[PDB]
Amino acid sequence: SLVTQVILSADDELRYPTAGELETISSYLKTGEYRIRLISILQGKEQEIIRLASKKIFQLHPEYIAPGGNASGARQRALCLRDYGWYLRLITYAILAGDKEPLEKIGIIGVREMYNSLGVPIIGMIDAIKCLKEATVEVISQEEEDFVAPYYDYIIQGMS
Amino acid sequence: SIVTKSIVNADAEARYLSPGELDRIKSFVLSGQRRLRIAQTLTENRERIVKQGGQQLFQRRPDVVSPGGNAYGEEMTATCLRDLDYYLRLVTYGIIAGDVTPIEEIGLVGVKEMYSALGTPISGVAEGIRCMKDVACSLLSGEDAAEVGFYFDYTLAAMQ
Amino acid sequence: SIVTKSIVNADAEARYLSPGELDRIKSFVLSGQRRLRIAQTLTENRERIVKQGGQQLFQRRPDVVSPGGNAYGEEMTATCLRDLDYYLRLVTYGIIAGDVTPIEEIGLVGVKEMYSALGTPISGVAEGIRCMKDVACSLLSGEDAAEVGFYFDYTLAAMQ
Amino acid sequence: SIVTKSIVNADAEARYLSPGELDRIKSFVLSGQRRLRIAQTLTENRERIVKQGGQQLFQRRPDVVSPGGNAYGEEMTATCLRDLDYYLRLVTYGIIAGDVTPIEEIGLVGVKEMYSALGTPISGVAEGIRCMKDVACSLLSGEDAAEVGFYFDYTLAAMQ
Amino acid sequence: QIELDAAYTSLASSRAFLAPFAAMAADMDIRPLYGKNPQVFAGQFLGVGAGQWGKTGADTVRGRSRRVAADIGVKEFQLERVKQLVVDLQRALALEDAEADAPATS
Amino acid sequence: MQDAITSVINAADVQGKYLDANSVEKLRGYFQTGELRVRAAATIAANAATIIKEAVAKSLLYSDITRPGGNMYTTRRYAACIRDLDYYLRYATYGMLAGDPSILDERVLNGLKETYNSLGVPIGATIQAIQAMKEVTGSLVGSDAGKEMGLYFDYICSGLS
Amino acid sequence: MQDAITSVINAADVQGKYLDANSVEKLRGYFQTGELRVRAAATIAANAATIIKEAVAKSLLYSDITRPGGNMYTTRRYAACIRDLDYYLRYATYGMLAGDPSILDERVLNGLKETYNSLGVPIGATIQAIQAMKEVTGSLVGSDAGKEMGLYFDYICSGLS
Amino acid sequence: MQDAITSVINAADVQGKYLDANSVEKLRGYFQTGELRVRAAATIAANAATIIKEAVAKSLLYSDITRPGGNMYTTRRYAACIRDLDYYLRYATYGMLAGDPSILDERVLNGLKETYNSLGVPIGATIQAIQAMKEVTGSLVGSDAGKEMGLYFDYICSGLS
Amino acid sequence: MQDAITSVINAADVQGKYLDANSVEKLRGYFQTGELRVRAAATIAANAATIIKEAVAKSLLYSDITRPGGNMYTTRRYAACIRDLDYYLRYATYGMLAGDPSILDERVLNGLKETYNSLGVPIGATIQAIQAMKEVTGSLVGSDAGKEMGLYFDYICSGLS
Amino acid sequence: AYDMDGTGAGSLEPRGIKSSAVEKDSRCFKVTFVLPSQSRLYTFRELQNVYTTKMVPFSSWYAEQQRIQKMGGKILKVELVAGGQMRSVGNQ
Amino acid sequence: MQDIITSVINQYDLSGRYLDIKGINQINNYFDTGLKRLMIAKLINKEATNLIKEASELLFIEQPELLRPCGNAFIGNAYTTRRYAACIRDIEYYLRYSAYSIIAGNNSILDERVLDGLKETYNSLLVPIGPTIRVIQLLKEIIQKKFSTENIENAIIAEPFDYLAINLSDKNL
Ligand SMILES: CCC1=C(C)/C(=C/C2=NC(=C\c3[nH]c(/C=C4\NC(=O)[C@H](C)[C@H]4CC)c(C)c3CCC(=O)O)/C(CCC(=O)O)=C2C)NC1=O
Ligand SMILES: CCC1=C(C)/C(=C/C2=NC(=C\c3[nH]c(/C=C4\NC(=O)[C@H](C)[C@H]4CC)c(C)c3CCC(=O)O)/C(CCC(=O)O)=C2C)NC1=O
């Protein structure tokens, strides 16, 4: 979290936090209860955002699922709805700890090489997350749409 | 400056500004008009702070104005308060910048070499800054006196 | 120690002691009787050197024994004199060992960190050693007072 | 020189020389009268020490001057004795310098590479220096023949 | 008790450590710069200034024998607390033995 | 390293669940007490040399370790010993700020005890100084901040035992 | 680096000669003054902080370079100023012991003028601080050793202009 | 490392005492025999090459060890053979000078028995080679000088078995 | 580091004899199979990234390791997994070319069972990853050459558990 | 020459680790630890052994043992193999 | 580097004076556009991968000589994909370091980490400076398209991309 970045950034200089570093912790800790309600709304719509986002990637990348691709099949499509319980789950972990570390320690680090083992077009998941951000905006108001917006872009920039 | 601190931290990681740094800069730009008020109150009350500040210093450390002390005489006591005016100036710089960087680069790096090569007790400069902080916090409201107290505190910790 | 310090410089290069280094060890053991005599002269004039040297210190530095000074109080003044007997004892180790390694490892490495943690002015401990150096140089011969002053001088340089 | 090694050694630590290090310089300048006299006694016996030394070397090593040896012929044996004069000259520099560093910096660094390239047996140059040591040590007193022999034994150890 | 007696032997060893210098500074001329006569400016040290006298007065005195004395007072507090605990334990044993010698079940 | 927030993130991540109601409850306790910890960490940073100076005096300057024949007798061993205490007080403030004692296991108690045993540093006298440092700091920051600081002073000692 | 002894050896070895009478007298000139140089070197090391402290007050302590706009204004620049003065004092003492200014060329003066021109340090004010530091030193060590130390103080100033 | 002089300074400093009569007697025992060690230390440094060449040929030269399949067979193994013997001879000369075998425990016997057992070096043969190196080195420095010399050769062999 | 021919030379060298009749058939045996080894290592290098793709999918793809709580869960842990298999395959290729498994001891298994034990990596699963990778390679490089590659895969598994 | 010349806060030299070793100290430990890279997945440098057992001087054990902790490493054992315990003089 | 506040605070420290109204008016001009300088940086963060493709495509449609062989003078252009990959990497450096200076309100970060040594590196690899000045100016024209309604955001955006072209340029006049 933001306190682990300040404590670590100061520890390698062998000092206590400064007047401006202690203010970074103060402002973040005072906005902790607004982040504690925002991620609860996301958890209530985890089953519905997939319903909107799954529609998007296949009409935009229909060549992935059709016969002629290698990984499609009636076998694996059963547990599809449980997917974003992992990725937008990390987006709830990042909305709580107000920084990019949970989205970067897990996820971004090693995600490209992870897929290159197969040969899958990595641009698909980059568009999968971009369409996911398109999905999370309709079930959420405009005021806190600016609050979860910068956390999605980091995933696109991290994968790219 | 807290802004400069957040741009060089993202530069080291070779990545763009993250959400944890973009809301911290928002907290600083949103708190700008309040810092310029506090920093301008210490600038308009320099005489009452430096003169009252040295007054209480000469009662906690009478040996600096005794025969043989460092600030003994009319011209050495005037140079005593010349230094309390330098450190009140650097504190206003640190309140406007949002961090203690201007204090560090000006009058905290190598401050022990300077006073040791002048013959001045370093514990007497820290005792004078602690007495200016009492007069300085009497002109401000309850919550603004806490904001300014962090910058006076950093100067004492570095001077010990 | 002259023997220890010249074996380390030959153990580094991994070679025997050269004829130049064995000639310096020879001229050291030849002066062994004279060094044991000078150390004996200081060891038996402890009270006079510590009593006379400490009395001069409290006349040149009255601030350490005035209210607020470190050596204020009958136990604080007696402990101020306990330190001067430490540095007088170490000087006898240095005269017998042929070098300042006994003085440096015991009471010169970390001396500034120590006295700063007790609140003692290091410039007052160096003034007390300078008051013992002339009281000790009045009790020795012309050539012995010159050799003894070398070890008192080295304790003055390392204490500034 | 003894002074040079004391100044460079105290420069690596960035400090002044200690009393143990200054005594080695005082003890060395006191023996300057004996060193200038011993070097003079060797410089006056060049033709005897060199010719006497090369005469005994060709009895312990008769193959070097026979047909096929390195020093076969008058011109070659002349350069044979030329080398012994180099090391006798270097030995007089070490006796006066107070240490073997002139012998090392001149004619000991890379000596095995030089003599391996010229086709000269390095074991014969060390045998010829050991014969000059007996001749030079027969012209001196009890203790002056002991130290001068140490400068001849250092050259042989570094030549094997 | 027998670690309070070890504290008293450390106080007796701390005074013998400093007694060559405690009596050697007893016939020196230690003149201060202020604090005694009122014609000299003393500042805070006309008396003591603003809360710095302490809860007791002996806690503001530094020294090797004052520091082992505060160890004695915290060690004698724990002995006196448990010596007053064996008093009312001894009361309840006698007040239950008065029930025994009175005609009852025991 | 992990603070109070990351502890629930590290926990929910391994089972793979979202944050539940009970997990949300303890985080409320950490967020509410935020400005309490930031104010305490500022006063400890200014009075750092004063907290160590009267904790050593209350603990070490009375015993026989400062006299000849004991540890921290020489100046080289007296400076090395008050250097450690400057680290214990700094890392204990990181724990109070982060709200979790995990940073003490990683960057304080990681190979530290085995170092003291070889060198011959008394482990019992080190606990006595950190314990004396606990009350001296408890007077500067108050009773509320003084209790949280005691959780990490007691943590350094329980793992150093 | 080479001292007065090695400077005589190299002059002879570069010709292939043994030490003749003209070089033996130079070797005697150094042995006769060896006890005087070791005596001055010990007094300079003990009064180094007061030689620098009094050369600074006399030359540049209340000048234009104290105040803002001038050089050595901030404490980080004041502290770097008196760290340069501690180089010249220590290396002028090495040259006095060795009796040869060779060490001032390699480890002090080689490329030191360009460093000051890039940093922007005034050379005229630096030479005045070494000259004020030469007068204070000459009063502590005497008149005979004092003019030896001034022999290597002028090598730095002339090697700096 | 601590020599005979430092070892008596240590015993006195742990009590806080000056150098008493029993201490000054041990110091004269070192000074009186000091110039004898300096003379024996230069005699062994001059005969170091022959003390090892005669010890090896007499002890382990035509032995099965130098035949194919043994230790010291290859030229590197032979060169590491005579490189080790010079290590002992050079360090036993450091101990005789200092009059205290403390330098042998830190820089020679620092876990040398485990290294020789792992590599497969015959400990029985190295002890007899050091012993053979004691009979040739003793005939050089005499009996009075060999007493302190052989005192450390047995220290290496005793600390090696 | 040593291959087959240098091990057959070492056998006759450790007895100091010349290469007799039996020694050459062990040499001709490696020479006759020299072309079969180099043609196999050419096909392995061209299909490295794919040979791992099924080995992970053959054993460790649908297991609990890729799921939360198990190892290989996070992307950083998945990337380290497949990165380790690539080094196993390369070093297993070097060993087959040399015909001696000595290279796997020096540069693979030196500190590997201790490293995995400290991190918490399962030795049982990794053994299945290499046993999985050993079977697929036997199809590409063929039956005869496929067993030789298998001989160095089980060597890594045997010395890893 | 030694790390404890008084350099602390508000000095010209940057804040770093300070050792309690004397000038040319000769005490060495024997340590054992594991230290993963934690940066190879964005640099792609070669793979190296992270299980180490080596002799480290007393003068650097504070800095080394404090660096292994910052970088996630774990120290498994440490012992003093050269030097005396509580020696006053004789560590040089 | 130095943000706008540090530059104004350092200019006053050089005189040894406090901050008057003139120095506080300058700090207020940054605290006014500061909330708008973040909307510009958050847009670059979301469109960063798109704004570089279009700048690269529009550059090569006008300068077709860059995608062709180098000529016997070994000029370093986007000839091969090893060069094309390396040259698209540069276009990110201009975009990344230009987003920093838009939040700093000052070009101190630009010259201290981009311009000091740039022409020495491009003259060493023979990389053309002419086209490089163009693609820096194409990024400016593109990013200004998102901000068309209000024109106070155009001045803020043009500052980093104008400084790079004025300082990489050769002085012909
Ligand atoms: C100051 C240090 C130093 C040394 C020692 C030195 C040696 C040196 N020895 C030389 C030749 C030689 N050196 C020898 C030496 C020997 N023949 C024997 O039988 C003996 C075993 C042995 C020693 C006396 C011979 C025979 C030559 C001439 C080789 C030839 O002409 O083929 C030469 C080439 C010709 C010359 O320039 O003189 C140099 C430079 N130079 C130096 O600067
Ligand atoms: C052998 C090397 C060595 C030294 C030097 C040493 C010093 C040392 N000085 C001490 C105290 C002290 N030292 C002083 C000294 C002074 N007050 C003044 O005004 C003067 C300027 C100065 C003496 C000249 C005072 C007043 C105390 C008591 C401080 C306290 O108890 O708070 C203490 C704590 C209590 C004690 O045991 O005395 C130590 C360990 N220890 C060592 O092992």
Ligand SMILES: CCC1=C(C)/C(=C/C2=NC(=C\c3[nH]c(/C=C4\NC(=O)[C@H](C)[C@H]4CC)c(C)c3CCC(=O)O)/C(CCC(=O)O)=C2C)NC1=O
């Ligand atoms: C941040 C976590 C951390 C700690 C704490 C740490 C401690 C540490 N303490 C050390 C020594 C030491 N530590 C002490 C400490 C003490 N003496 C006493 O009497 C007291 C009980 C105690 C002070 C509370 C002493 C005297 C030494 C020197 C030991 C010697 O020289 O023999 C050393 C050996 C290196 C050196 O001294 O420079 C280390 C590495 N390292 C770490 O990474």
Ligand SMILES: CCC1=C(C)/C(=C/C2=NC(=C\c3[nH]c(/C=C4\NC(=O)[C@H](C)[C@H]4CC)c(C)c3CCC(=O)O)/C(CCC(=O)O)=C2C)NC1=O
């Ligand atoms: C902006 C950062 C900064 C500071 C702080 C600074 C200090 C500074 N203090 C000085 C002197 C002095 N400073 C004092 C100060 C004191 N006497 C006491 O008793 C008190 C404890 C203490 C003040 C509270 C005295 C008495 C002098 C004159 C000393 C002398 O002339 O010998 C001087 C030398 C005269 C001059 O050039 O002005 C400088 C440069 N310079 C800087 O650039």
Ligand SMILES: CCC1=C(C)/C(=C/C2=NC(=C\c3[nH]c(/C=C4\NC(=O)[C@H](C)[C@H]4CC)c(C)c3CCC(=O)O)/C(CCC(=O)O)=C2C)NC1=O
């Ligand atoms: C300064 C203190 C010190 C010692 C003593 C020391 C010993 C030491 N002896 C070694 C090897 C060796 N030691 C021997 C020794 C012997 N062979 C015999 O027949 C005899 C029994 C014996 C003595 C002559 C041989 C043959 C090797 C080579 C082993 C190999 O290359 O595998 C090695 C391995 C490094 C190398 O290959 O050179 C070390 C480190 N290192 C040290 O730092």
Ligand SMILES: CCC1=C(C)/C(=C/C2=NC(=C\c3[nH]c(/C=C4\NC(=O)[C@H](C)[C@H]4CC)c(C)c3CCC(=O)O)/C(CCC(=O)O)=C2C)NC1=O
């Ligand atoms: C050349 C011989 C050699 C090997 C093999 C080697 C391995 C090695 N594996 C590592 C980590 C690792 N290795 C794994 C491996 C696995 N996880 C699983 O589930 C699988 C069962 C298994 C792979 C088959 C994981 C997950 C980590 C990271 C652990 C962590 O980050 O907590 C690390 C730490 C450095 C880093 O992760 O960047 C090294 C050095 N080093 C060597 O020198």
Ligand SMILES: CCC1=C(C)/C(=C/C2=NC(=C\c3[nH]c(/C=C4\NC(=O)[C@H](C)[C@H]4CC)c(C)c3CCC(=O)O)/C(CCC(=O)O)=C2C)NC1=O
């Ligand atoms: C943060 C500031 C900064 C910049 C800008 C920077 C540039 C930079 N550009 C480079 C190469 C290059 N840059 C280009 C660029 C181009 N080719 C064209 O035709 C176009 C005009 C242009 C693309 C717009 C090419 C082709 C190379 C490789 C040249 C070669 O290897 O032949 C290299 C050498 C490769 C390397 O990085 O190791 C550096 C250092 N470094 C920096 O630190």
Ligand SMILES: CCC1=C(C)/C(=C/C2=NC(=C\c3[nH]c(/C=C4\NC(=O)[C@H](C)[C@H]4CC)c(C)c3CCC(=O)O)/C(CCC(=O)O)=C2C)NC1=O
């Ligand atoms: C020597 C190895 C090598 C090759 C081949 C290479 C190709 C290469 N092809 C490119 C574009 C392109 N390449 C193609 C098309 C194709 N490409 C094909 O190999 C197919 C035959 C065809 C698709 C069927 C197209 C349509 C573009 C323009 C894409 C764009 O507008 O960005 C570009 C970007 C600049 C440009 O030419 O417009 C490079 C550098 N670079 C190299 O170093």
Ligand SMILES: CCC1=C(C)/C(=C\C2=NC(=C\c3[nH]c(/C=C4\NC(=O)[C@H](C)[C@H]4CC)c(C)c3CCC(=O)O)/C(CCC(=O)O)=C2C)NC1=O
């Ligand atoms: C942060 C959470 C996390 C994940 C997910 C992960 C690993 C992971 N999940 C994967 C595939 C996956 N592939 C699919 C299905 C598909 N793939 C798609 O992009 C479409 C939706 C569909 C096309 C056919 C699903 C649902 C998973 C996740 C688990 C599984 O079902 O295998 C793959 C590709 C290779 C494989 O394992 O088969 C990896 C490496 N590591 C992690 O740390």
